[PDB]
Ligand binder design. Structure first.
Ligand SMILES: C=CC1=C(C)/C(=C/c2[nH]c(Cc3[nH]c(Cc4[nH]c(OC(C)(C)C)c(C)c4C=C)c(C)c3CCC(=O)O)c(CCC(=O)O)c2C)NC1=O
Ligand SMILES: [Fe+3]
Ligand code: NA
Length: 248
């Protein structure tokens, strides 16, 4: 359903150079998970019915950073500002989505296709569109399905993004990594979810909801058994998420 806009050759050159600078920066700073969260949070405010929110640069606004669900993302925005300044031609919207794609790549994940041309929009979406980690499958479908327009497959695949990173008691209140290797992108999020709760690892109520849902569970099983299948479905879902409201 996508018709990607034309951008100048200079814009394309900047995308390519910024991608490389982002790899080095994100790897050195060890901030891939935070950058993936920034990109996803960013994108996850899209409401299909109204065509509002989405990955349009608004997360840099103090007003959106102040949203409770975005606790700690001000760190991400600050970290990227010096690099962003080297690429004045790029929209923030594109830059943050490129950072999310790079975060996945430099931790060993799939190569998520990237298309430039998102415009920076003036108005942040209203607060309260991002999902509540204490809720379950009905809520997940309300947010990913009814608002964003993503599929049940996309929900489970994207949940696997938690294979990198950790919660912080000072941010959400939850604490700790989902996996034993929080800077490695692999299917361990699903392996861990299946094995039960191991000491030192985190499972949110929203993660556990995947295990008991008739549609979500076979997907968890598939991804735990087949990392290639996870990578394919993840790449599809991340691309879709990063393009919500963009190019149709
Ligand atoms: C399925 C719904 C879902 C919920 C409710 C969710 C909630 C959630 N996600 C994160 C961290 C968190 N989330 C993510 C990727 C992420 N998150 C996300 O869901 C949203 C909300 C965007 C829809 C998507 C679609 C993606 C990527 C594909 C990373 C990489 C980290 C680690 C951050 C770090 O290490 O600092 C925290 C801890 C924040 C903190 O305390 O530092 C919480 C409470 N994440 C979820 O996926
Ligand atoms: Fe998350
Ligand atoms: Na991992």
């Amino acid at each position: 359903g996508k018709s990607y806009p034309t951008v100048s050759a200079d814009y394309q050159k900047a995308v390519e150079k910024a991608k490389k600078k982002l790899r080095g920066f994100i790897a050195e700073k060890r901030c891939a998970p935070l950058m993936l969260r920034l990109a996803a949070h960013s994108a996850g405010t899209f409401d299909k019915g109204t065509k509002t929110g989405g990955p349009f640069g608004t997360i840099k606004h103090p007003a959106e950073l102040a949203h409770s669900a975005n606790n700690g993302l001000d760190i991400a925005v600050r970290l990227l500002e010096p690099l962003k300044a080297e690429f004045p031609i790029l929209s923030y919207a594109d830059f943050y989505q490129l950072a999310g794609v790079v975060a996945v790549e430099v931790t060993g994940g799939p190569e998520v296709p990237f298309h430039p041309g998102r415009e920076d929009k003036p108005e942040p979406p209203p607060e309260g569109r991002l999902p509540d980690a204490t809720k379950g499958s009905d809520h997940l479908r309300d947010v990913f399905g009814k608002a964003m327009g993503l599929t049940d497959q996309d929900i489970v695949a994207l949940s696997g993004g938690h294979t990198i990173g950790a919660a912080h008691k000072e941010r959400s209140g939850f604490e700790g990594p989902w996996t034993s290797n929080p800077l490695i992108f692999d299917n361990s999020y699903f392996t861990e979810l299946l094995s039960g709760e191991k000491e030192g690892l985190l499972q949110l109520p929203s993660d556990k909801a995947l295990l008991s849902d008739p549609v979500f569970r076979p997907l968890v099983d598939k991804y735990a058994a087949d990392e290639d299948a996870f990578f394919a479905d993840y790449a599809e879902a991340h691309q879709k998420l990063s393009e919500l409201g963009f190019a149709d």
